Protein backbone atom coordinates (compact mmCIF):
# COMPACT_ATOMS: atom_id res chain seq x y z
CA UNK A 270 0.00 0.00 0.00
CA UNK A 271 0.89 3.70 0.23
CA UNK A 272 -0.51 7.09 1.21
CA UNK A 273 0.83 8.86 -1.90
CA UNK A 274 2.63 7.75 -5.08
CA UNK A 275 6.24 7.31 -4.00
CA UNK A 276 6.51 3.53 -3.65
CA UNK A 277 4.81 2.04 -6.75
CA UNK A 278 7.41 2.26 -9.52
CA UNK A 279 5.06 0.69 -12.09
CA UNK A 280 4.87 3.97 -14.03
CA UNK A 281 8.66 3.89 -14.57
CA UNK A 282 8.84 0.33 -15.94
CA UNK A 283 9.76 0.55 -19.63
CA UNK A 284 10.00 -3.21 -20.22
CA UNK A 285 8.22 -5.97 -18.33
CA UNK A 286 5.89 -5.78 -15.36
CA UNK A 287 6.53 -5.62 -11.62
CA UNK A 288 3.36 -7.70 -11.29
CA UNK A 289 4.86 -10.65 -13.19
CA UNK A 290 7.82 -10.83 -10.81
CA UNK A 291 7.92 -13.26 -7.87
CA UNK A 292 7.04 -11.56 -4.60
CA UNK A 293 10.57 -11.38 -3.19
CA UNK A 294 11.93 -10.27 -6.57
CA UNK A 295 9.52 -7.32 -6.66
CA UNK A 296 10.40 -6.24 -3.12
CA UNK A 297 14.10 -6.44 -4.03
CA UNK A 298 13.58 -4.41 -7.21
CA UNK A 299 11.20 -1.80 -5.77
CA UNK A 300 13.09 -1.39 -2.50
CA UNK A 301 16.32 -0.49 -4.29
CA UNK A 302 14.44 1.56 -6.89
CA UNK A 303 13.16 3.66 -3.99
CA UNK A 304 16.71 3.84 -2.59
CA UNK A 305 18.61 4.48 -5.84
CA UNK A 306 15.86 6.52 -7.55
CA UNK A 307 16.35 5.42 -11.17
CA UNK A 308 14.50 7.29 -13.89
CA UNK A 309 13.41 4.03 -15.55
CA UNK A 310 13.17 0.33 -14.70
CA UNK A 311 13.95 -2.24 -17.42
CA UNK A 312 13.22 -5.89 -16.61
CA UNK A 313 15.48 -7.84 -18.97
CA UNK A 314 13.93 -10.73 -20.89
CA UNK A 315 17.24 -11.83 -22.46
CA UNK A 316 15.82 -11.80 -25.99
CA UNK A 317 17.79 -11.05 -29.14
CA UNK A 318 15.49 -8.07 -29.76
CA UNK A 319 16.34 -6.54 -26.38
CA UNK A 320 20.04 -7.27 -26.89
CA UNK A 321 20.04 -5.58 -30.29
CA UNK A 322 18.34 -2.42 -29.03
CA UNK A 323 20.66 -2.33 -26.01
CA UNK A 324 23.69 -2.47 -28.32
CA UNK A 325 22.17 0.19 -30.59
CA UNK A 326 21.46 2.39 -27.57
CA UNK A 327 25.05 2.05 -26.34
CA UNK A 328 26.27 2.77 -29.87
CA UNK A 329 24.15 5.93 -29.97
CA UNK A 330 25.47 7.04 -26.56
CA UNK A 331 29.09 6.52 -27.61
CA UNK A 332 29.53 3.78 -25.02
CA UNK A 333 30.54 1.09 -27.54
CA UNK A 334 31.76 1.01 -31.13
CA UNK A 335 30.86 -1.51 -33.80
CA UNK A 336 33.82 -3.53 -35.08
CA UNK A 337 32.84 -3.55 -38.75
CA UNK A 338 35.37 -6.23 -39.70
CA UNK A 339 33.62 -8.93 -37.65
CA UNK A 340 30.11 -10.35 -37.19
CA UNK A 341 28.27 -8.55 -34.38
CA UNK A 342 31.38 -7.61 -32.39
CA UNK A 343 31.72 -4.47 -30.31
CA UNK A 344 34.46 -2.47 -28.60
CA UNK A 345 34.16 -0.67 -25.27
CA UNK A 346 36.79 1.75 -23.97
CA UNK A 347 36.77 2.29 -20.22
CA UNK A 348 37.96 5.08 -17.99
CA UNK A 349 41.68 4.37 -17.42
CA UNK A 350 40.98 4.46 -13.66
CA UNK A 351 38.44 1.60 -13.90
CA UNK A 352 40.39 -1.03 -15.85
CA UNK A 353 40.48 -4.04 -13.52
CA UNK A 354 39.03 -5.92 -10.58
CA UNK A 355 40.14 -4.11 -7.41
CA UNK A 356 41.12 -6.49 -4.61
CA UNK A 357 41.77 -3.79 -1.99
CA UNK A 358 38.18 -2.52 -2.33
CA UNK A 359 36.66 -6.02 -2.05
CA UNK A 360 35.23 -6.89 1.37
CA UNK A 361 33.16 -9.62 3.03
CA UNK A 362 30.73 -8.71 5.80
CA UNK A 363 30.18 -11.10 8.71
CA UNK A 364 29.27 -10.44 12.33
CA UNK A 365 32.48 -12.26 13.33
CA UNK A 366 35.74 -11.58 11.51
CA UNK A 367 36.87 -15.15 12.16
CA UNK A 368 34.10 -16.43 9.87
CA UNK A 369 35.66 -14.58 6.91
CA UNK A 370 39.41 -14.85 7.59
CA UNK A 371 41.65 -16.67 10.04
CA UNK A 372 42.94 -14.36 12.75
CA UNK A 373 46.58 -13.85 11.70
CA UNK A 374 49.24 -14.44 14.32
CA UNK A 375 51.41 -11.37 13.66
CA UNK A 376 50.41 -9.23 10.67
CA UNK A 377 47.51 -8.41 8.36
CA UNK A 378 45.48 -11.13 6.67
CA UNK A 379 46.06 -11.79 2.96
CA UNK A 380 43.25 -14.37 2.80
CA UNK A 381 40.41 -11.84 2.66
CA UNK A 382 39.20 -8.36 3.55
CA UNK A 383 36.68 -8.31 6.40
CA UNK A 384 34.37 -5.40 7.20
CA UNK A 385 31.86 -5.23 10.04
CA UNK A 386 28.16 -4.67 9.45
CA UNK A 387 28.28 -1.29 11.20
CA UNK A 388 31.12 -0.03 9.00
CA UNK A 389 29.48 -1.31 5.81
CA UNK A 390 26.16 0.38 6.62
CA UNK A 391 28.03 3.69 6.84
CA UNK A 392 29.83 3.00 3.55
CA UNK A 393 26.61 1.81 1.90
CA UNK A 394 24.48 4.79 2.96
CA UNK A 395 27.35 7.03 1.79
CA UNK A 396 27.12 5.68 -1.78
CA UNK A 397 23.80 4.28 -2.98
CA UNK A 398 21.02 6.78 -2.03
CA UNK A 399 20.04 8.42 -5.32
CA UNK A 400 23.04 6.92 -7.13
CA UNK A 401 20.93 5.98 -10.19
CA UNK A 402 19.29 9.39 -10.66
CA UNK A 403 18.40 9.95 -14.31
CA UNK A 404 19.53 6.43 -15.26
CA UNK A 405 17.78 3.18 -16.10
CA UNK A 406 17.82 0.37 -13.54
CA UNK A 407 18.16 -2.91 -15.42
CA UNK A 408 16.86 -6.06 -13.71
CA UNK A 409 18.96 -9.04 -14.80
CA UNK A 410 17.51 -12.45 -13.88
CA UNK A 411 20.36 -14.90 -14.44
CA UNK A 412 21.19 -18.53 -13.71
CA UNK A 413 24.65 -19.77 -12.77
CA UNK A 414 24.92 -23.20 -14.35
CA UNK A 415 22.47 -24.87 -16.74
CA UNK A 416 18.82 -24.24 -15.98
CA UNK A 417 17.38 -26.96 -13.77
CA UNK A 418 20.86 -28.23 -12.92
CA UNK A 419 21.06 -29.51 -9.32
CA UNK A 420 24.13 -27.31 -8.73
CA UNK A 421 22.60 -24.31 -10.52
CA UNK A 422 21.77 -21.16 -8.55
CA UNK A 423 19.75 -18.13 -9.64
CA UNK A 424 20.58 -14.49 -9.05
CA UNK A 425 19.08 -11.08 -9.73
CA UNK A 426 21.44 -8.23 -10.56
CA UNK A 427 20.23 -4.63 -10.48
CA UNK A 428 22.49 -2.32 -12.45
CA UNK A 429 22.45 1.07 -14.18
CA UNK A 430 24.99 0.01 -16.81
CA UNK A 431 23.84 -1.36 -20.21
CA UNK A 432 27.41 -2.61 -20.67
CA UNK A 433 26.83 -4.90 -17.68
CA UNK A 434 23.53 -6.15 -19.12
CA UNK A 435 25.13 -7.02 -22.47
CA UNK A 436 28.10 -8.72 -20.80
CA UNK A 437 25.86 -10.66 -18.40
CA UNK A 438 23.82 -11.94 -21.34
CA UNK A 439 27.04 -13.56 -22.60
CA UNK A 440 28.55 -14.64 -19.28
CA UNK A 441 25.35 -16.09 -17.73
CA UNK A 442 22.00 -17.56 -18.69
CA UNK A 443 19.78 -14.47 -18.60
CA UNK A 444 16.18 -13.73 -19.50
CA UNK A 445 12.55 -14.45 -18.74
CA UNK A 446 13.05 -18.22 -18.58
CA UNK A 447 15.09 -17.69 -15.40
CA UNK A 448 12.27 -15.90 -13.58
CA UNK A 449 9.93 -18.74 -14.53
CA UNK A 450 12.47 -21.26 -13.24
CA UNK A 451 13.06 -19.27 -10.05
CA UNK A 452 9.39 -19.01 -9.11
CA UNK A 453 9.18 -18.28 -5.39
CA UNK A 454 12.61 -19.86 -4.86
CA UNK A 455 15.62 -18.28 -3.20
CA UNK A 456 17.95 -16.07 -5.22
CA UNK A 457 21.20 -14.19 -4.70
CA UNK A 458 20.60 -10.44 -4.49
CA UNK A 459 23.10 -8.50 -6.61
CA UNK A 460 23.08 -4.69 -6.51
CA UNK A 461 25.44 -2.70 -8.74
CA UNK A 462 25.83 0.97 -9.62
CA UNK A 463 28.55 2.86 -11.48
CA UNK A 464 27.96 5.65 -8.96
CA UNK A 465 27.36 8.53 -11.40
CA UNK A 466 23.87 9.94 -10.78
CA UNK A 467 22.74 12.52 -13.31
CA UNK A 468 23.31 15.42 -13.67
CA UNK A 469 27.02 14.58 -13.75
CA UNK A 470 29.34 16.38 -11.34
CA UNK A 471 32.57 14.91 -12.77
CA UNK A 472 33.07 14.82 -16.56
CA UNK A 473 33.11 11.27 -17.92
CA UNK A 474 36.29 9.90 -19.49
CA UNK A 475 35.72 7.89 -22.68
CA UNK A 476 31.97 7.96 -21.91
CA UNK A 477 32.73 5.43 -19.15
CA UNK A 478 30.65 6.02 -16.03
CA UNK A 479 32.57 5.07 -12.87
CA UNK A 480 33.45 6.35 -9.40
CA UNK A 481 36.95 5.14 -8.50
CA UNK A 482 37.15 7.06 -5.21
CA UNK A 483 33.99 5.43 -3.83
CA UNK A 484 34.54 2.02 -5.43
CA UNK A 485 33.54 -0.82 -3.11
CA UNK A 486 32.64 -4.46 -3.79
CA UNK A 487 30.86 -5.98 -0.78
CA UNK A 488 29.68 -9.51 -0.02
CA UNK A 489 27.12 -10.39 2.68
CA UNK A 490 26.86 -14.20 2.66
CA UNK A 491 24.47 -14.34 5.63
CA UNK A 492 22.03 -12.12 3.70
CA UNK A 493 22.84 -13.65 0.29
CA UNK A 494 23.58 -10.15 -1.03
CA UNK A 495 26.32 -8.78 -3.29
CA UNK A 496 26.62 -4.99 -3.32
CA UNK A 497 29.05 -3.36 -5.76
CA UNK A 498 29.55 0.38 -6.32
CA UNK A 499 31.71 2.66 -8.45
CA UNK A 500 33.19 0.27 -11.02
CA UNK A 501 31.80 -0.95 -14.33
CA UNK A 502 34.66 -3.32 -15.10
CA UNK A 503 34.56 -7.13 -15.22
CA UNK A 504 34.74 -8.77 -11.81
CA UNK A 505 33.47 -5.62 -10.11
CA UNK A 506 30.26 -5.39 -12.18
CA UNK A 507 29.54 -8.87 -13.60
CA UNK A 508 28.46 -9.98 -10.15
CA UNK A 509 27.76 -13.60 -11.10
CA UNK A 510 31.40 -14.33 -11.94
CA UNK A 511 33.72 -13.77 -8.97
CA UNK A 512 31.39 -12.27 -6.36
CA UNK A 513 28.67 -14.90 -6.87
CA UNK A 514 30.29 -17.98 -8.41
CA UNK A 515 33.34 -17.97 -6.10
CA UNK A 516 33.01 -15.85 -2.94
CA UNK A 517 29.31 -16.31 -2.14
CA UNK A 518 29.35 -19.79 -3.69
CA UNK A 519 32.38 -21.03 -1.74
CA UNK A 520 30.51 -20.23 1.48
CA UNK A 521 27.36 -21.98 0.28
CA UNK A 522 29.41 -24.99 -0.86
CA UNK A 523 30.97 -25.19 2.60
CA UNK A 524 27.48 -25.18 4.10
CA UNK A 525 26.01 -27.64 1.58
CA UNK A 526 28.93 -30.02 1.06
CA UNK A 527 30.25 -29.14 -2.40
CA UNK A 528 33.06 -27.00 -3.85
CA UNK A 529 33.19 -23.65 -5.67
CA UNK A 530 36.68 -23.37 -7.13
CA UNK A 531 38.83 -21.18 -9.39
CA UNK A 532 39.36 -24.00 -11.86
CA UNK A 533 39.11 -24.67 -15.55
CA UNK A 534 37.48 -27.92 -16.63
CA UNK A 535 38.66 -29.81 -19.70
CA UNK A 536 37.98 -33.22 -21.19
CA UNK A 537 40.88 -35.06 -22.79
CA UNK A 538 40.55 -38.10 -25.07
CA UNK A 539 43.54 -40.31 -25.81
CA UNK A 540 44.39 -42.30 -28.97
CA UNK A 541 42.73 -45.39 -27.43
CA UNK A 542 39.34 -43.66 -27.25
CA UNK A 543 39.46 -43.18 -23.47
CA UNK A 544 38.33 -39.78 -22.18
CA UNK A 545 38.98 -38.20 -18.77
CA UNK A 546 37.98 -34.85 -17.29
CA UNK A 547 40.53 -32.69 -15.48
CA UNK A 548 40.28 -29.52 -13.41
CA UNK A 549 43.12 -27.02 -13.00
CA UNK A 550 43.50 -24.12 -10.57
CA UNK A 551 45.94 -21.48 -11.81
CA UNK A 552 46.03 -17.84 -10.68
CA UNK A 553 44.99 -15.15 -13.13
CA UNK A 554 47.29 -14.74 -16.14
CA UNK A 555 48.82 -18.19 -15.53
CA UNK A 556 47.27 -20.15 -18.41
CA UNK A 557 43.83 -21.53 -17.50
CA UNK A 558 42.21 -20.33 -20.74
CA UNK A 559 45.14 -21.53 -22.86
CA UNK A 560 45.04 -24.97 -21.23
CA UNK A 561 41.25 -25.34 -21.38
CA UNK A 562 41.24 -24.51 -25.12
CA UNK A 563 44.61 -26.11 -25.90
CA UNK A 564 45.32 -27.39 -29.40
CA UNK A 565 47.34 -30.51 -28.50
CA UNK A 566 50.48 -31.22 -30.51
CA UNK A 567 50.37 -34.99 -29.89
CA UNK A 568 48.54 -36.86 -32.69
CA UNK A 569 45.48 -38.80 -31.62
CA UNK A 570 44.88 -36.55 -28.59
CA UNK A 571 41.81 -34.32 -28.29
CA UNK A 572 41.22 -31.53 -25.75
CA UNK A 573 37.70 -30.21 -25.18
CA UNK A 574 36.73 -27.19 -23.09
CA UNK A 575 34.02 -27.37 -20.42
CA UNK A 576 35.05 -24.10 -18.78
CA UNK A 577 38.04 -21.85 -18.25
CA UNK A 578 37.61 -20.15 -14.88
CA UNK A 579 35.03 -21.48 -12.40
CA UNK A 580 34.11 -25.02 -11.35
CA UNK A 581 31.28 -26.11 -9.06
CA UNK A 582 31.99 -29.62 -7.84
CA UNK A 583 30.22 -32.19 -5.68
CA UNK A 584 30.50 -35.91 -5.06
CA UNK A 585 27.51 -37.75 -6.51
CA UNK A 586 25.82 -40.87 -5.13
CA UNK A 587 28.41 -43.16 -6.75
CA UNK A 588 31.35 -41.32 -5.17
CA UNK A 589 32.51 -39.50 -8.30
CA UNK A 590 33.53 -35.84 -8.10
CA UNK A 591 31.23 -34.14 -10.61
CA UNK A 592 31.89 -30.63 -11.90
CA UNK A 593 29.96 -28.09 -13.95
CA UNK A 594 31.01 -24.77 -15.44
CA UNK A 595 28.46 -22.33 -13.94
CA UNK A 596 29.29 -19.69 -16.56
CA UNK A 597 27.86 -19.20 -20.04
CA UNK A 598 30.86 -17.64 -21.80
CA UNK A 599 34.54 -16.75 -21.60
CA UNK A 600 35.90 -13.50 -20.15
CA UNK A 601 39.55 -13.93 -21.07
CA UNK A 602 42.57 -11.67 -21.29
CA UNK A 603 43.08 -10.49 -24.87
CA UNK A 604 46.82 -9.67 -25.10
CA UNK A 605 48.94 -12.74 -25.75
CA UNK A 606 46.04 -14.43 -27.56
CA UNK A 607 47.33 -15.33 -31.04
CA UNK A 608 46.77 -18.03 -33.65
CA UNK A 609 49.88 -19.89 -32.48
CA UNK A 610 49.12 -19.67 -28.75
CA UNK A 611 45.31 -20.03 -28.60
CA UNK A 612 43.89 -20.58 -32.11
CA UNK A 613 40.67 -21.95 -30.60
CA UNK A 614 40.13 -18.64 -28.81
CA UNK A 615 40.69 -16.75 -32.08
CA UNK A 616 37.99 -18.83 -33.78
CA UNK A 617 35.61 -18.12 -30.88
CA UNK A 618 35.93 -14.33 -30.61
CA UNK A 619 35.25 -13.53 -34.27
CA UNK A 620 31.51 -12.96 -33.73
CA UNK A 621 28.97 -12.00 -31.07
CA UNK A 622 31.87 -10.86 -28.90
CA UNK A 623 32.38 -7.70 -26.83
CA UNK A 624 35.93 -6.38 -26.48
CA UNK A 625 37.04 -3.98 -23.74
CA UNK A 626 40.12 -1.75 -24.00
CA UNK A 627 41.77 -3.52 -26.95
CA UNK A 628 43.09 -1.55 -29.91
CA UNK A 629 40.98 -1.00 -33.02
CA UNK A 630 42.34 -1.27 -36.54
CA UNK A 631 41.33 1.20 -39.23
CA UNK A 632 39.43 -1.55 -41.10
CA UNK A 633 37.21 -2.35 -38.11
CA UNK A 634 39.30 -5.05 -36.45
CA UNK A 635 40.91 -5.65 -33.07
CA UNK A 636 44.58 -5.52 -32.13
CA UNK A 637 46.63 -6.16 -29.00
CA UNK A 638 50.12 -7.08 -27.88
CA UNK A 639 51.06 -10.62 -28.82
CA UNK A 640 48.35 -11.09 -31.47
CA UNK A 641 51.26 -12.19 -33.70
CA UNK A 642 49.34 -11.18 -36.85
CA UNK A 643 50.68 -8.69 -39.42
CA UNK A 644 48.40 -5.88 -40.57
CA UNK A 645 47.71 -5.05 -44.20
CA UNK A 646 49.40 -2.03 -45.79
CA UNK A 647 47.63 1.19 -44.85
CA UNK A 648 45.88 -0.28 -41.81
CA UNK A 649 46.22 2.06 -38.83
CA UNK A 650 45.73 1.32 -35.13
CA UNK A 651 43.81 3.24 -32.47
CA UNK A 652 44.90 2.47 -28.92
CA UNK A 653 42.52 1.66 -26.08
CA UNK A 654 43.11 5.29 -25.01
CA UNK A 655 41.26 6.34 -28.20
CA UNK A 656 44.41 7.77 -29.79
CA UNK A 657 46.50 7.14 -32.88
CA UNK A 658 49.02 4.43 -31.98
CA UNK A 659 52.30 3.44 -33.62
CA UNK A 660 54.51 0.48 -32.63
CA UNK A 661 57.31 3.01 -32.00
CA UNK A 662 55.64 4.44 -28.88
CA UNK A 663 56.14 2.82 -25.49
CA UNK A 664 52.39 2.92 -24.81
CA UNK A 665 50.82 -0.49 -25.48
CA UNK A 666 47.89 -0.20 -27.87
CA UNK A 667 45.77 -2.55 -25.72
CA UNK A 668 45.52 -2.43 -21.94
CA UNK A 669 47.25 -5.42 -20.30
CA UNK A 670 43.94 -6.36 -18.64
CA UNK A 671 41.92 -5.84 -21.83
CA UNK A 672 39.30 -8.51 -22.42
CA UNK A 673 37.09 -10.36 -24.83
CA UNK A 674 33.63 -11.45 -23.68
CA UNK A 675 32.53 -14.33 -25.90
CA UNK A 676 29.76 -16.95 -25.81
CA UNK A 677 31.06 -20.35 -24.75
CA UNK A 678 28.79 -22.09 -27.27
CA UNK A 679 30.92 -20.66 -30.10
CA UNK A 680 34.12 -22.40 -28.97
CA UNK A 681 34.91 -25.00 -31.67
CA UNK A 682 36.16 -27.45 -29.02
CA UNK A 683 33.44 -26.81 -26.43
CA UNK A 684 32.80 -30.10 -24.68
CA UNK A 685 29.57 -31.86 -25.74
CA UNK A 686 28.72 -32.07 -22.01
CA UNK A 687 29.63 -28.50 -21.02
CA UNK A 688 25.92 -27.85 -20.34
CA UNK A 689 25.04 -31.28 -18.92
CA UNK A 690 23.20 -30.70 -15.61
CA UNK A 691 24.83 -33.82 -14.14
CA UNK A 692 28.33 -32.39 -14.56
CA UNK A 693 31.47 -34.21 -15.69
CA UNK A 694 33.44 -36.66 -13.50
CA UNK A 695 36.77 -35.16 -12.40
CA UNK A 696 39.59 -37.71 -12.25
CA UNK A 697 42.47 -35.27 -11.74
CA UNK A 698 43.09 -31.86 -10.18
CA UNK A 699 45.99 -29.65 -11.26
CA UNK A 700 47.60 -26.81 -9.31
CA UNK A 701 50.18 -24.45 -10.75
CA UNK A 702 51.47 -20.94 -11.13
CA UNK A 703 54.37 -18.86 -12.39
CA UNK A 704 57.50 -20.12 -10.62
CA UNK A 705 60.65 -18.96 -12.45
CA UNK A 706 62.89 -21.27 -10.40
CA UNK A 707 63.01 -24.40 -8.29
CA UNK A 708 59.63 -25.95 -9.11
CA UNK A 709 59.80 -28.77 -11.71
CA UNK A 710 57.57 -29.15 -14.75
CA UNK A 711 55.15 -31.57 -13.07
CA UNK A 712 54.86 -33.70 -9.97
CA UNK A 713 52.09 -35.78 -8.41
CA UNK A 714 50.93 -35.60 -4.80
CA UNK A 715 51.64 -38.52 -2.48
CA UNK A 716 48.10 -38.61 -1.06
CA UNK A 717 44.93 -36.56 -0.69
CA UNK A 718 46.27 -34.78 2.39
CA UNK A 719 49.54 -33.96 0.63
CA UNK A 720 47.54 -32.80 -2.38
CA UNK A 721 45.57 -30.40 -0.20
CA UNK A 722 48.90 -29.17 1.18
CA UNK A 723 50.20 -28.68 -2.37
CA UNK A 724 47.24 -26.43 -3.16
CA UNK A 725 47.65 -24.54 0.10
CA UNK A 726 51.36 -23.96 -0.61
CA UNK A 727 50.80 -22.56 -4.12
CA UNK A 728 52.89 -19.51 -4.97
CA UNK A 729 53.24 -17.51 -8.17
CA UNK A 730 54.98 -14.41 -9.47
CA UNK A 731 53.10 -11.12 -9.68
CA UNK A 732 51.19 -10.86 -12.96
CA UNK A 733 48.70 -8.26 -14.27
CA UNK A 734 45.38 -9.43 -12.80
CA UNK A 735 44.66 -7.29 -9.72
CA UNK A 736 46.56 -4.16 -8.66
CA UNK A 737 49.81 -6.04 -7.96
CA UNK A 738 53.00 -4.99 -9.75
CA UNK A 739 56.73 -5.70 -9.75
CA UNK A 740 58.52 -9.05 -9.88
CA UNK A 741 57.47 -10.74 -6.62
CA UNK A 742 56.46 -14.28 -5.69
CA UNK A 743 53.29 -14.30 -3.57
CA UNK A 744 51.02 -16.92 -2.04
CA UNK A 745 47.77 -17.87 -3.79
CA UNK A 746 46.59 -21.17 -2.28
CA UNK A 747 44.25 -23.06 -4.61
CA UNK A 748 44.42 -19.94 -6.81
CA UNK A 749 41.70 -18.63 -4.49
CA UNK A 750 43.47 -15.90 -2.49
CA UNK A 751 41.25 -13.11 -3.93
CA UNK A 752 38.09 -15.23 -3.81
CA UNK A 753 37.76 -17.03 -0.46
CA UNK A 754 34.21 -16.67 0.79
CA UNK A 755 35.09 -17.68 4.35
CA UNK A 756 37.88 -18.71 6.72
CA UNK A 757 40.69 -20.28 4.71
CA UNK A 758 41.53 -22.64 7.56
CA UNK A 759 37.96 -23.93 7.49
CA UNK A 760 38.39 -24.13 3.70
CA UNK A 761 41.34 -26.50 4.17
CA UNK A 762 39.42 -28.67 6.65
CA UNK A 763 36.54 -28.77 4.16
CA UNK A 764 38.88 -30.05 1.45
CA UNK A 765 40.47 -32.55 3.86
CA UNK A 766 37.04 -33.84 4.89
CA UNK A 767 36.37 -35.15 1.37
CA UNK A 768 38.71 -38.05 2.17
CA UNK A 769 36.22 -39.11 4.86
CA UNK A 770 33.35 -39.45 2.38
CA UNK A 771 32.23 -43.08 1.92
CA UNK A 772 33.07 -44.56 -1.48
CA UNK A 773 34.56 -41.21 -2.52
CA UNK A 774 36.69 -41.54 -5.66
CA UNK A 775 39.29 -38.90 -4.89
CA UNK A 776 40.98 -37.52 -8.03
CA UNK A 777 44.73 -37.48 -8.37
CA UNK A 778 46.39 -34.15 -7.59
CA UNK A 779 49.20 -32.76 -9.74
CA UNK A 780 51.27 -29.58 -9.62
CA UNK A 781 52.60 -28.13 -12.87
CA UNK A 782 54.96 -25.26 -13.70
CA UNK A 783 54.95 -24.04 -17.30
CA UNK A 784 57.16 -21.09 -16.37
CA UNK A 785 60.50 -22.36 -15.04
CA UNK A 786 63.39 -20.34 -16.47
CA UNK A 787 67.09 -21.03 -16.91
CA UNK A 788 70.00 -18.84 -15.80
CA UNK A 789 69.42 -16.66 -18.89
CA UNK A 790 65.78 -15.93 -18.07
CA UNK A 791 64.58 -18.15 -20.92
CA UNK A 792 61.63 -20.51 -20.56
CA UNK A 793 62.81 -24.11 -20.25
CA UNK A 794 59.44 -25.46 -21.48
CA UNK A 795 57.76 -24.35 -24.73
CA UNK A 796 54.30 -24.79 -23.22
CA UNK A 797 50.99 -24.03 -24.93
CA UNK A 798 49.99 -27.01 -27.12
CA UNK A 799 53.10 -28.89 -25.97
CA UNK A 800 51.51 -29.18 -22.51
CA UNK A 801 49.57 -32.11 -24.00
CA UNK A 802 52.72 -34.12 -23.28
CA UNK A 803 52.32 -33.35 -19.57
CA UNK A 804 48.60 -34.17 -19.69
CA UNK A 805 49.49 -37.50 -21.31
CA UNK A 806 51.62 -38.39 -18.29
CA UNK A 807 48.82 -37.43 -15.90
CA UNK A 808 46.39 -39.48 -18.01
CA UNK A 809 48.58 -42.57 -17.69
CA UNK A 810 49.14 -41.96 -13.98
CA UNK A 811 45.37 -41.91 -13.46
CA UNK A 812 45.10 -45.25 -15.26
CA UNK A 813 47.77 -46.59 -12.90
CA UNK A 814 50.80 -46.70 -15.21
CA UNK A 815 54.11 -47.32 -13.44
CA UNK A 816 55.62 -44.16 -14.91
CA UNK A 817 56.39 -42.23 -11.71
CA UNK A 818 59.55 -41.82 -9.63
CA UNK A 819 59.43 -40.89 -5.95
CA UNK A 820 61.05 -37.62 -4.88
CA UNK A 821 60.88 -35.60 -1.65
CA UNK A 822 58.21 -33.29 -3.14
CA UNK A 823 56.09 -36.05 -4.69
CA UNK A 824 56.11 -38.33 -7.72
CA UNK A 825 57.81 -37.08 -10.88
CA UNK A 826 57.92 -38.77 -14.30
CA UNK A 827 60.48 -41.50 -14.81
CA UNK A 828 63.24 -41.00 -17.34
CA UNK A 829 61.78 -41.29 -20.86
CA UNK A 830 58.29 -41.39 -19.33
CA UNK A 831 57.50 -38.01 -20.89
CA UNK A 832 56.90 -38.03 -24.64
CA UNK A 833 59.61 -35.56 -25.69
CA UNK A 834 59.92 -36.55 -29.35
CA UNK A 835 59.85 -33.61 -31.73
CA UNK A 836 61.57 -31.55 -29.02
CA UNK A 837 64.72 -33.29 -27.74
CA UNK A 838 66.51 -29.93 -27.42
CA UNK A 839 64.77 -29.48 -24.05
CA UNK A 840 67.05 -29.28 -21.02
CA UNK A 841 65.45 -32.09 -19.01
CA UNK A 842 67.98 -31.88 -16.16
CA UNK A 843 67.27 -28.27 -15.23
CA UNK A 844 63.55 -28.72 -15.95
CA UNK A 845 63.05 -31.46 -13.34
CA UNK A 846 65.95 -30.58 -11.05
CA UNK A 847 65.04 -30.68 -7.36
CA UNK A 848 67.47 -28.62 -5.28
CA UNK A 849 67.66 -29.17 -1.53
CA UNK A 850 68.84 -25.58 -1.08
CA UNK A 851 65.81 -24.18 -2.92
CA UNK A 852 63.26 -26.40 -1.18
CA UNK A 853 64.69 -25.83 2.29
CA UNK A 854 63.90 -22.16 1.64
CA UNK A 855 60.50 -22.99 0.14
CA UNK A 856 59.29 -24.98 3.16
CA UNK A 857 60.34 -22.15 5.49
CA UNK A 858 58.32 -19.55 3.58
CA UNK A 859 55.31 -21.88 3.49
CA UNK A 860 55.80 -22.52 7.21
CA UNK A 861 55.98 -18.83 8.11
CA UNK A 862 53.03 -18.10 5.82
CA UNK A 863 50.73 -20.86 7.07
CA UNK A 864 51.66 -20.11 10.69
CA UNK A 865 50.90 -16.39 10.43
CA UNK A 866 48.01 -16.38 7.95
CA UNK A 867 46.12 -19.49 9.10
CA UNK A 868 47.36 -19.57 12.74
CA UNK A 869 44.84 -21.29 15.02
CA UNK A 870 42.64 -22.51 12.12
CA UNK A 871 45.34 -24.56 10.37
CA UNK A 872 44.28 -28.23 10.31
CA UNK A 873 46.78 -30.57 11.92
CA UNK A 874 46.97 -32.78 8.82
CA UNK A 875 48.19 -29.75 6.86
CA UNK A 876 50.78 -29.03 9.56
CA UNK A 877 51.78 -32.71 9.42
CA UNK A 878 52.36 -32.55 5.66
CA UNK A 879 54.53 -29.46 6.16
CA UNK A 880 56.50 -31.35 8.81
CA UNK A 881 56.74 -34.40 6.54
CA UNK A 882 57.94 -32.36 3.56
CA UNK A 883 60.50 -30.62 5.77
CA UNK A 884 61.77 -34.03 6.90
CA UNK A 885 62.06 -35.55 3.42
CA UNK A 886 63.99 -32.50 2.21
CA UNK A 887 66.36 -32.56 5.19
CA UNK A 888 67.23 -36.15 4.20
CA UNK A 889 68.39 -35.02 0.74
Ligand SMILES: Nc1nc2c(ncn2[C@@H]2O[C@H](COP(=O)(O)OP(=O)(O)O)[C@@H](O)[C@H]2O)c(=O)[nH]1
Nearest residue numbers: 553554555556557558559602604605783796797
Ligand atom coordinates in the same frame (compact mmCIF):
# COMPACT_ATOMS: atom_id res chain seq x y z
N1 LIG B 1 55.20 -19.70 -21.40
C1 LIG B 1 53.87 -19.99 -21.37
N2 LIG B 1 52.98 -18.97 -21.32
C2 LIG B 1 51.65 -19.22 -21.29
C3 LIG B 1 51.18 -20.61 -21.32
N3 LIG B 1 49.84 -20.57 -21.29
C4 LIG B 1 49.47 -19.27 -21.23
N4 LIG B 1 50.55 -18.46 -21.24
C5 LIG B 1 50.53 -16.98 -21.19
O1 LIG B 1 49.83 -16.51 -20.03
C6 LIG B 1 49.05 -15.35 -20.36
C7 LIG B 1 47.66 -15.51 -19.77
O2 LIG B 1 47.14 -16.78 -20.17
P1 LIG B 1 45.59 -17.11 -19.91
O3 LIG B 1 45.18 -18.39 -20.61
O4 LIG B 1 44.71 -15.96 -20.33
O5 LIG B 1 45.60 -17.27 -18.31
P2 LIG B 1 44.26 -17.37 -17.43
O6 LIG B 1 43.87 -16.00 -16.93
O7 LIG B 1 44.53 -18.25 -16.23
O8 LIG B 1 43.14 -17.96 -18.26
C8 LIG B 1 48.98 -15.26 -21.87
O9 LIG B 1 49.56 -14.03 -22.31
C9 LIG B 1 49.78 -16.44 -22.39
O10 LIG B 1 50.71 -16.03 -23.40
C10 LIG B 1 52.22 -21.66 -21.39
O11 LIG B 1 51.92 -22.87 -21.42
N5 LIG B 1 53.50 -21.28 -21.41
Ligand SMILES: [Mn+2]
Nearest residue numbers: 531552553578
Ligand atom coordinates in the same frame (compact mmCIF):
# COMPACT_ATOMS: atom_id res chain seq x y z
MN1 LIG C 1 39.69 -16.13 -12.91
Ligand SMILES: [Mn+2]
Nearest residue numbers: 557558601602
Ligand atom coordinates in the same frame (compact mmCIF):
# COMPACT_ATOMS: atom_id res chain seq x y z
MN1 LIG D 1 41.27 -16.66 -18.47
Ligand SMILES: [Mn+2]
Nearest residue numbers: 718765768874
Ligand atom coordinates in the same frame (compact mmCIF):
# COMPACT_ATOMS: atom_id res chain seq x y z
MN1 LIG E 1 41.97 -36.89 7.77
